[model samples]
Target: MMNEKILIVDDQYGIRILLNEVFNKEGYQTFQAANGLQALDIVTKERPDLVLLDMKIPGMDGIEILKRMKVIDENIRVIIMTAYGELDMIQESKELGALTHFAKPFDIDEIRDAVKKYLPLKSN
Candidate 1:
């Protein structure tokens, strides 16, 4: 929320759309990246303050994506999208600086509040 911009990084098209809509409704500037490589490009170009990354993407994977993102901006905040429970991967992402996580089958309102929890509400 440092920049009031959030990048939605997920392989699923619906997830990106849903999150984008929700955040946008909450007064955030939102964008979407379908996969890890695309996400990296957006990170380099857009410099969003927050990233909602899907940890189970094919090819580059979320861990590597987060690593490269750290190289781009050390303080960029990230929240991973996990399926079921991946304690080890979750632990790793935390070490790599992921701010928190949102499991699948999540409540949209819950995510909205979480974003505001780390990123203060925008009153514009």
Candidate 2:
């Protein structure tokens, strides 16, 4: 009953639902949010152990979303995901407190490994 929660903020339902929540299969009780507002609302209700945040959200951009989450949790753990290779955007989020990042077509192995790396606690 102690599974670590994972919050995934992505506009891409294909990636989030298509995999049937890869993180969930790994035993995590994943929380999926399609936009910044939803993500923030989830964060407010239940702070997750980690967040997989996307840069291109529908209403609010990733940076602003990150900022909003930070206001709620100063030490919230985060990882950036974007379709672009812009280091500028990546670096900005990093400075604001992100653990790391990946391109849109991010490897599932890498994400799984990183999540497990950052959250070593047993999901169950």
Candidate 3:
């Protein structure tokens, strides 16, 4: 929904842009961070409803960011983005209350579907 905010945390500019476009088209108020510290700052400042997090980021990694974000807003939903064979981190994220995950090179449709499923747009 236009009223719902989603934060996207990733080091890659293209990934951030892609997601920003997708969610914006769906009418979500989207914020983006290129590193862990920036993500934390946005988390505190914006208090977004959901975070799309990348695992291997600079400055603080996804897991730590996720943990700290929870401290800021425990109810915030997170969906992690990771590469292959990072099961341990994915599992840990799950244990720490992550809603779900997507491996890198993921399908945009799947991501959109997941986002829609987890945080559907509100009726205008």
Candidate 4:
């Protein structure tokens, strides 16, 4: 069984599916959302160990999602993914307590490495 679960939030179907496939290959329990509303629903239900969020989504963006999520669970780790090349957004996410942020077309190996780095040790 997979030891870690992750949520991928993106408005683009292709990106979400790609991430899901990649993570599944690595034995991660993966969840997905096409928009913030849907993502919020899933977040509340599962409270995954990690969240990889896209910044330019419709209705609700990554920062908004992070803000609300912080309210729900202060300890959740989030990684923001943005295509806009915005350094400010990265800083913002950090200020809002996100663990890390990645640019779009992000390196899969790097992201997976980050996930491995952040996973909490399983309690016996």
Candidate 5:
């Protein structure tokens, strides 16, 4: 079996860089995208085991990304992040098939645990 792979999708480069470092340090293979379109591309090419997605982006919002991701692979685990604090978006995302959702400036440990929980059983 191979190590779990995670894709960090955020419009902010800093956020993507930080997540890449964090997940990589924890022994997971990590990828990054600056927007939902790039994230969609990564999903098809990298075929990540999980996705850390930002809700607000210049194009193709997180909800749309989640919707499209299901078309590619319904089983892909996606964790949505947003600063909007919109309970509606959270509920909608869940309904749209998001595995988890988080507010921006979230706790690293929380996301870390979520990643671990959703990772494949046979994944390293």
Candidate 6:
């Protein structure tokens, strides 16, 4: 199987670890970053199939990172995960081409389902 890659960008350590474990368990090649700069670096280098991004972070934040990420890879799929469910940010994320938005305290199974929807499983 050609393993699909996923980049998890979140400031919270627990969030990152939770997603990392979930995706890795599902057979993805998962990369993680705690802030926008590191997220951009990984996106540029790895060009992951999907990005599980947090809307809040120190430095660039998710929206800015999303814009820059699109510059690097226009087809990169992103799903924003945020504790804040502000309409403006959600609208912006959508306008910037995010696949969807997930409010914080999201269901892990739901996220896994979303990932599967975007990056389908490949048979070995």
Each candidate's number of clashing pairs is 0, 1, 0, 0, 0, 0
- How accurate locally is residue 75 in candidate 6, as Cα lDDT from 0 to 100? 78
Q: Which candidate achieves the best TM-score against the true structure?
A: 1
Taking the tens digit of each residue's C-alpha lDDT, what string does model 5 give over 11-94?
766777767787877778888787788887888878886887876666666777788887787887788887646576787676
Put down candidate 6 lDDT per residue, 13-105, tens digits, no spaces. Answer: 788787878877787888878778887778778878688777667555678778887777677788887764566688767677688888778
Between candidates 4 and 6, which one is better according to TM-score? 6
TM-score of 4: 0.84
Candidate 3 regions with alpha-carbon error over 4 angstroms: none
Q: In candidate 4, which residue pairs clash? A: none
Give the clash total for candidate 2: 1
Worst 10 residues of 6 by lDDT: 83-92
What is the model-wide C-alpha lDDT for candidate 6?
A: 0.77
Better model by TM-score, 1 or 2? Answer: 1
- Candidate-wise lDDT, in order: 0.79, 0.75, 0.79, 0.76, 0.76, 0.77
* Tens-place lDDT digits, model 3, residues 28-109: 8889887778877887788787888887675556787788877776787978888756586787786786988887788889
In model 6, which residue pairs have backbone atoms overlapping below 3 Å? none
lDDT, model 4, position 8: 88
- Per residue, candidate 4 scores C-alpha lDDT tens digits across 1-124 of 2457688888777778777887877767789886777778887788786888787676666677788888888888878887546586787677786888887777778877787678843333
Candidate 5's clash total is 0
> Which pairs clash inside model 3?
none
lDDT of 1 at 66: 84
Model 4 stretches with alpha carbons more than 4 Å out: 1-3, 120-124
Predicted candidate 1 versus true structure: per-residue lDDT over 1-124, tens digit per residue: 2468778887765777788788877888878877788877877788887898887566556888888888777788988888657675887786777888788889998888888888776565
Stretch of 10 with least lDDT, candidate 3: 55-64
* Model 5, C-alpha of 44: deviation from truth (Å): 1.1
Candidate 6 accuracy as TM-score: 0.86
Instruction: Give the C-alpha miss distance for residue 99 in model 2, angstroms.
Output: 0.7
